[PDB]
From a paper:
Fungal immunomodulatory proteins (FIPs) are a group of low-molecular-weight (MW) proteins investigated as potential anti-tumor drugs. FIP-nha (from Nectria haematococca) contains two glycosylation sites at positions N5 and N39. In this study, the impact of glycosylation on the bioactivity and biochemical characteristics of FIP-nha (from Nectria haematococca) is described. Taken together, these findings indicate that glycosylation of FIP-nha impacts its thermostability and digestion resistance.
Author numbering:
A (entry chain A): 5 to 114
B (entry chain B): 6 to 114
C (entry chain C): 6 to 30, 34 to 114
D (entry chain D): 6 to 29, 36 to 114
Write the structure that this text describes.
């Protein structure tokens, strides 16, 4: 039951809109996923992203900048030494809170 | 409160809401007779409880969520057909139909 | 819901509470006691009997052993409530007037 | 934060925990009474450097759990000069929450 939390948020911020519907970008070949873009990301803090590939923590990188349409791109090339991630691997993407370094899963591939 | 927001993101990828209060005024202008929210949450058919100057006016049935996402709370339905004099504090609570929990969403003075 | 739990651990490193409802019965329910209530704010309680809002009353003191008792005689014009009906008990937040369910009978 | 406190009260009506950091050169961190709803792991970060995750020691009968920094720092304690952050790791999603900090 998550109404108590939702309205804890409404209490703090009356007007809020976000969209973390995952857009998985595919390089060449299509087998590989090389990016993830969110249509509308939270902007209260300059969040960072951590990527996990098949159980391997690829660490934290600087975020690409929120674009004027509110979207943000995570470029997996920046985390994976210049290579896409084969789509048979599970990919986890975390937001990292800059204040305490907390990590929250926001996207998962398979 | 980042931990709570992303708890919401975890369960609800895409969410938009707007409870910026639009205080309606009858005639005379001194009286507030309504409150309108531009875009309410719709996951549950919430209702509204109104407290006028510390007096609990109780719960009533919600007006319809309109096609633009808006929802109106008519204080005439809580205050026996009179607006609320703007010198009184007004508290509006959403009521959770599952457990009857109450959460403040708008406050006049 | 682990994010929320550790949000609490974050704000408050050490915490113990116990709201396991001890109902006071022998067919009418005359009271409800909680072994260990939260004490960060002086909470009041609102009681609803079989859907009927009996409203808010002033709280009894938290006892030395951390317990607090809600006496339904103060809410129901001096009368117990028959187990027939569903009793809901809400904590009332004195800051904003919010209320959260914390106990239910049937 | 009362709204969230009582949401926890709602989900579990009886609960006690104690994460007041017992620091023991700092070799280790002990928590008198950890949550046990999941089998949490811990991640350590030293002076900004991610030491990563290690398997957890068993929760003691008195509810306490010990994090041993020798397992995270290649057999060496951490000098109190540096800031140590300690995160619980949620085994379901891999989320991490800060639960202790040294300066």
């Amino acid at each position: 039951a998550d109404s108590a939390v939702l309205f804890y948020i409404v209490a703090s911020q009356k007007k809020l809109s976000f969209d973390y519907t995952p857009n998985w970008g595919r390089g060449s070949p299509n087998s590989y996923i090389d990016a993830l873009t969110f249509p509308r990301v939270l902007t209260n803090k300059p969040y960072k992203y951590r990527v996990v590939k098949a159980g391997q923590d690829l660490g934290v990188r600087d975020s690409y900048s929120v674009q004027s349409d509110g979207s943000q791109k995570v470029n997996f090339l920046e985390y994976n030494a210049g290579r896409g991630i084969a789509d048979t691997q599970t990919i986890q993407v975390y937001v990292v809170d800059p204040d305490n370094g907390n990590q929250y899963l926001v996207a998962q591939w398979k």
